[PDB]
Swiss-Prot record, chain D:
Span within the parent record: 394 to 442 of 1407
Lineage: Bacteria, Pseudomonadati, Pseudomonadota, Gammaproteobacteria, Enterobacterales
Species whose genome carries this gene: Escherichia coli O139:H28 (strain E24377A / ETEC)
Designated name of the protein: DNA-directed RNA polymerase subunit beta'
Origin: domain of life: Bacteria
Role this protein plays: DNA-dependent RNA polymerase catalyzes the transcription of DNA into RNA using the four ribonucleoside triphosphates as substrates.
Known partners and oligomeric status: The RNAP catalytic core consists of 2 alpha, 1 beta, 1 beta' and 1 omega subunit. When a sigma factor is associated with the core the holoenzyme is formed, which can initiate transcription.
Membership in a protein family: Belongs to the RNA polymerase beta' chain family.
UniProtKB/Swiss-Prot annotation, chain E:
PTM: Acetylated on several lysine residues in the presence of glucose.
Subunit structure as annotated in this protein's UniProt entry: The RNAP catalytic core consists of 2 alpha, 1 beta, 1 beta' and 1 omega subunit. When a sigma factor is associated with the core the holoenzyme is formed, which can initiate transcription. The rRNA transcription and antitermination complex (rrnTAC) consists of RNAP, NusA, NusB, NusE (rpsJ), NusG, SubB, ribosomal protein S4, DNA and precursor rRNA; S4 is more flexible than other subunits. In pull-down experiments interacts with CedA. (Microbial infection) Interacts (via flap domain) with Escherichia phage lambda antitermination protein Q; this interaction renders bacterial RNAP resistant to transcription pausing and allows it to read through termination signals.
Application notes: Co-administration of salinamide and rifampicin or salinamide and myxopyronin suppresses the emergence of resistance to both antibiotics.
Complete-protein stretch covered: 1194 to 1243 of 1342
Name listed for the protein in its UniProt record: DNA-directed RNA polymerase subunit beta
Similarity comment text for this entry: Belongs to the RNA polymerase beta chain family.
Known role: DNA-dependent RNA polymerase (RNAP) catalyzes the transcription of DNA into RNA using the four ribonucleoside triphosphates as substrates. Resistance to the antibiotics salinamide A, salinamide B, rifampicin, streptolydigin, CBR703, myxopyronin, and lipiarmycin can result from mutations in this protein.
RNA sequence: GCAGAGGUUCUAGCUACACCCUCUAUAAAAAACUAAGGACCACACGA
């Protein structure tokens, strides 16, 4: 659980990009099969996405990197 | 608050009265002039009466 | 009729060895407070425990004075004595002699061992000395009294901190049981001087309160 | 969904601890009827009481 | 008149008692008013508005 | 009664129809929780064919705001009453005075913020001694309409219902007087030609005190009717 | 630390009686006082009625004929029936009053075990010699306050509220008793006010027992 | 399980938001189950 978001917004400092990136990350962690790269403590996907952000691990460009890595791994097994 | 730089989460009426009763002075009160070894000792003194 | 839910030290998440936070399982409503307040009164009121009660400064004789070299006012070399957590066994009115010269602070480790008298905070800086020639000394008389007692109630007299605990605060809050409406989760967050462990402080306070109940103890 | 509806309509004890599980980090929008400023609708982590 | 009626009963004239706390069991400083106000109960219940 | 009133609450409690006033002085010949029989005194007697004056009280009856219009006899068997006297304390009345609410010990102090802004902090002692419990009388109308190919009939012959549904109902589709019904429970049959049973709206609970079965001429009353 | 011990149970009345402990160490006075008062007011085994069965009354809002009081406030009177049991944990008490006259609690057809302590507690006023109330009053044990709803069946059963709270008013008053030669032994008194169903000595005994048992949560024996 | 019908129950049950199995013109060995729902004005007010 967590209370505030300042430690999260400070590195995504638009306070709106935070919502979008953590939302897509929580999507990939909830509807996708991705496991949280930050330890889970009986916490929903939203606070898990925030924690993954605050640890300097999940950001917009990191999410794009993960997306294109998945794309490359998908198209590598299709050839 | 977006209206002004004054914070909107402000202790409204009862907590502020309690704080005023706390943070005040009367020139004669039980155990005045004592020297304290930190705020924790002040809490220990007050809760012991 | 008499079945009452009892917790077992459910959360003892001690932060440091001088500050723990005991949080019990839900207790029947009206009992979180009746236990927190009881233990608070026991702990802030009376336990066996040694602390400084008075001191005779060698050179200084009045309560309001100052000696050179010791930039700390004598009133402050008295507060640091109140902070001087000391534990003794068997002996009660033991007198401790402090004697050190030279530039620098006077740590609590400078007090001579004086038999079985132990100090739990050796690096407690009482006062600082700025001169090699200045030889500060005193006879700090610690005592294993029971419970806090200031100097106004009763050579320089200092307030006593006979209670090993320094801060008692219980913030009882609602808990839940599968059907029971509202049971209270007591949360004792408590510090100590360091002489006695916080968990041990709670255990000894409970022991004292129960021993004051043995006459009407049944089953 | 019929079985789940029956279970939640009977509000078994297995439903309450599941509910407190699903409201772990789920904010709800409290709202006053005559809202004027945007501070008139905030969110909180609701605690089951 | 109300003061004299209070003093007829074995009650303080000032109208304030020293309410000991129910939990701490310690005296409330600044003795507090205690009396029998005629409290109504309005029709606007909650179980018809929950 | 209000521990501090205005003296005119008695007037506002007697002028209203809530309290059955003694229009004829005399001695209470027979009092009861439902009726009060007044033996008229000789002075107030009508010339001939005189006798008693039965103040038939109105027991729990639904108000307009769904409160209990209840009357309590405040006299006993053998206590004289006079002209303009008060006999039955109606709703929110006590011995002829007006007692809207109740009165209890009140102390003005901030008690750990539970009475933060304007909120009251009532003790469990109030609920324990049943001090502020209020009866609320709800009404559940149900009609039987002239539906084509057989009208609406109120029968316990409900389909797709277990014995739990027929438990509170009688052998003719109407709940017994005094069943601890709860949310969703059935009260009235109302089988429509092809199941439109009047059921307890969700949330509302409590006993059922009285069922009234109106009927226009042209249809025979069923067993409960 | 001198331990407290019961020294006086002065029975100023049957409804209430003060219990005094001769020795108590400085500070422990108000400690034990508040603990005992709280644990007495909150949790003490009561005996208040739980279920009544009028003879010819279906729901609690009906009005039997002959009784000068409607059934609802008959129940309201009953929920404060000062009764105590000795051998059972639940009992059903039968009442059969006939003829004009208030139905005092003494009219309850009691047994050798269940004995009422206020035989003048009026239940209802019968106003007809041809009318007769008949109640199968169910009396249970328990503690605290339990409403009618929050207890998890025939028509005749009238689920009355439960008031298992023998004590009504507890008030401790520390004093100063000069025991032996040591001062500051604050004598403690307990101006408790029961409803006549619990011995003040036994009340303090059980309250201390439960305080110790719950205090044994974090201590050995 | 996406176009229909049948099955052990209970008239009818083919994903209708909807619950199990079969196949493309044929009906039964089988327990947990079922219904997609309702507008406009006056008044007492309450924040």
């Amino acid at each position: 659980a967590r209370v505030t978001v300042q430690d999260a917004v400070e590195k995504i400092g638009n306070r709106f990009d935070l919502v979008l990136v953590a939302a897509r990350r929580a999507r990939q962690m909830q509807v996708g099969g991705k496991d949280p790269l930050v330890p889970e403590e009986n916490d929903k996907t939203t606070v898990i996405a925030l924690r993954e952000i605050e640890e300097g691990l999940i950001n917009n460009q990191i999410l794009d990197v993960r997306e294109r890595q998945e794309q490359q791994e998908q198209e590598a097994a299709e050839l | 608050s977006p209206a002004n730089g004054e914070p909107i989460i402000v202790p409204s009426q009862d907590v502020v009265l309690g704080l005023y009763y706390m943070t005040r002075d009367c020139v004669n009160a039980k155990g005045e002039g004592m020297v304290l070894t930190g705020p924790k000792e002040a809490e220990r003194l007050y809760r012991s009466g | 009729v008499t079945e009452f839910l009892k917790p077992r030290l459910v959360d003892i998440e001690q932060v440091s060895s001088t500050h723990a936070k005991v949080t019990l399982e839900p207790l029947e409503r009206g009992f979180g407070h009746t236990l927190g307040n009881a233990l608070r009164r026991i702990l802030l009121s009376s336990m066996p425990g040694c602390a400084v009660t008075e001191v005779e400064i060698d050179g200084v004789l009045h309560e309001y004075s100052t000696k050179e070299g010791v930039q700390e006012d004598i009133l402050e070399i008295l507060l640091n004595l109140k902070g001087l957590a000391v534990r003794v066994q068997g002996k009660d009115e033991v007198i401790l002699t402090l004697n050190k010269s030279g530039i620098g602070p006077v740590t609590a480790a400078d007090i001579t061992h004086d038999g079985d008298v132990e100090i739990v905070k050796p690096q407690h800086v009482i006062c600082h000395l700025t001169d090699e020639n200045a030889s500060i000394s005193m006879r700090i008389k610690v005592q294993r009294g029971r419970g806090y007692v200031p100097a106004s109630t009763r050579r320089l007299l200092v307030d006593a901190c006979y209670s090993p605990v320094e801060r008692i605060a219980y913030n009882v809050e609602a808990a839940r049981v599968e059907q029971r409406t509202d049971l209270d989760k007591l949360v004792i967050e408590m510090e100590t001087n360091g002489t006695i462990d916080p968990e041990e402080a709670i255990r000894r306070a409970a022991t004292i309160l129960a021993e004051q109940l043995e006459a009407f103890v049944d089953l | 969904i019929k079985a789940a509806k029956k279970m939640v309509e009977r509000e078994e004890a297995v439903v309450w601890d599941i509910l407190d599980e699903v409201i772990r980090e789920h904010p709800v929008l409290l709202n006053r009827a005559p809202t004027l400023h945007r501070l008139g609708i905030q969110a909180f982590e609701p605690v089951l009481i | 008149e109300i003061k004299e009626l209070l003093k007829l009963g074995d009650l303080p004239t000032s109208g304030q008692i020293r309410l000991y706390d129910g939990r701490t069991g310690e005296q409330f400083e600044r003795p507090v008013t205690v009396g029998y106000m005629y409290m109504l109960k309005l029709n606007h219940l909650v179980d018809d508005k929950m | 009664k209000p521990l501090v009133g205005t003296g005119m609450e008695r007037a506002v409690a007697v002028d209203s129809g809530v309290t059955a006033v003694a229009k004829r002085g005399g001695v209470v010949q027979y009092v009861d929780a439902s009726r009060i029989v007044i033996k008229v005194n000789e002075d107030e007697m009508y010339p001939g064919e005189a006798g008693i004056d039965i103040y038939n009280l109105t027991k729990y009856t639904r108000s307009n705001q769904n409160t209990c219009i209840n009357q309590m006899p405040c006299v006993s068997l053998g206590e004289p009453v006079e002209r303009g006297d008060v006999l039955a304390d109606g709703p929110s009345t006590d011995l002829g005075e007006l007692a809207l609410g109740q009165n209890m010990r009140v102390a003005f102090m901030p008690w750990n913020g539970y009475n933060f802004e304007d909120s009251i902090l009532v003790s469990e002692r109030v609920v324990q001694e049943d001090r502020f419990t209020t009866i609320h009388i709800q009404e559940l109308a149900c009609v039987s309409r002239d539906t084509k190919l057989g009208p609406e009939e109120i029968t316990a012959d409900i389909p797709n219902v277990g014995e739990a549904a027929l438990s509170k109902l009688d052998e003719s589709g109407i709940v017994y007087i005094g069943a601890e019904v709860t949310g969703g429970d059935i009260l009235v049959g109302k089988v429509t030609p092809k199941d439109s049973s009047l059921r307890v709206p969700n949330g509302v609970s409590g006993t059922v005190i009285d069922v009234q079965v109106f009927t226009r001429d042209g249809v025979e009353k069923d067993k409960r009717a």
